[PDB]
């Protein structure tokens, strides 16, 4: 079902997931082995010793034993709930050792080393060595790509400036900050800064003219005078500090 990068383990230092895989593969195996037992509709006592042995596996382990449950109905309910694997409780610093995982793998009639040689279903050939296969518990985080994607070309603009922002019906353009301006400056990226700061961002006359130009079937630009600097100019003048233009 899931393919994980094996390269993330030898660096990010989380091999517990690897163990989570192996202890998973055993557990689902215990789930699968009894599942077949369910398909043959075998007699109840057989499931009884199978579950009793499955829970009894381990050394100095506190789980207690059956039959303390009801002979038939509760055993059947437990087996039906255990057909999709068998839950395993692993205390964080008192969990299962390697030997216990290997024993549970063996009871599952699965490779005790925890690796079964897969066949690459893409092309249909086995690899030079077996791969690590098992059942791991994956969490779907609330960082959905649907909620994270966005883009825009034309839409809302502020009433104080012509920067694009507003709501989520059409959110404004992405914030190309001064860090990325320096990134462009390091290149010979000189025009690109001018389009991405003047015509694509602020100059309303520039925005309209460039949109008309692209619609008309060409990619040409008007230089423009960004409104952001006009706002800064006006508010400097607002404090009794003069700004003027040395006209060319």
């Amino acid at each position: 079902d899931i393919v994980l990068n094996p390269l993330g383990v030898p660096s990010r230092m989380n091999i517990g997931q690897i163990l989570e895989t192996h202890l998973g593969m055993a557990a689902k195996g215990i789930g699968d082995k009894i599942n077949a037992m369910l398909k043959q509709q075998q007699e109840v006592a057989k499931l009884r010793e199978f579950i009793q042995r499955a829970y009894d596996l381990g050394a100095d382990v506190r789980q207690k034993v059956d039959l303390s449950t009801f002979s038939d109905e509760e055993v059947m309910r437990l087996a039906e709930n255990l057909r999709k694997g068998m839950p395993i409780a692993t205390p964080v610093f008192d969990g299962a050792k390697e030997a216990e995982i290997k024993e549970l793998l063996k009871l599952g009639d699965l490779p005790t080393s925890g690796q079964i040689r897969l066949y690459d279903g893409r092309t249909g050939e086995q690899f030079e060595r077996p791969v690590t296969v098992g059942y791991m518990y994956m969490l779907k985080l609330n960082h959905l790509v649907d909620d994270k994607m966005h883009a825009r070309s034309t839409g809302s603009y502020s009433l104080v400036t012509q920067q694009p922002l507003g709501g989520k019906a059409q959110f404004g353009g992405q914030r190309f900050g001064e860090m990325e301006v320096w990134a462009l400056e390091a290149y010979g990226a000189a025009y690109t800064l001018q389009e991405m700061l003047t015509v694509k961002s602020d100059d309303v006359n520039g925005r309209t003219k460039m949109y008309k130009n692209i619609v008309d079937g060409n990619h040409q630009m008007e230089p423009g005078m960004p409104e952001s600097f006009n706002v800064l100019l006006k508010e400097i003048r607002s404090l009794g500090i003069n700004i003027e233009l040395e006209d060319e």
Binding site: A59, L78, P87, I88, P91, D94, E100
Partner: protein, 50 residues
């Protein structure tokens, strides 16, 4: 033992029995607000002290 526990037993590999069971994990909020809002026979944390 719990009846909902009988419907699905989870195998534990723990090796030391839990000497102290896990207490109510939201005890902080309830204890704080009950100390706040309950009656007091003497001046102690709560509306009475204020």
């Amino acid at each position: 033992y719990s009846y909902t526990e009988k419907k699905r037993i989870r195998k534990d590999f723990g090796k030391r029995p839990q000497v102290l069971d896990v207490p109510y994990l939201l005890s902080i909020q309830l204890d704080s607000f009950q100390k706040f809002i309950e009656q007091d026979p003497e001046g102690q944390y709560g509306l009475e002290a204020a």
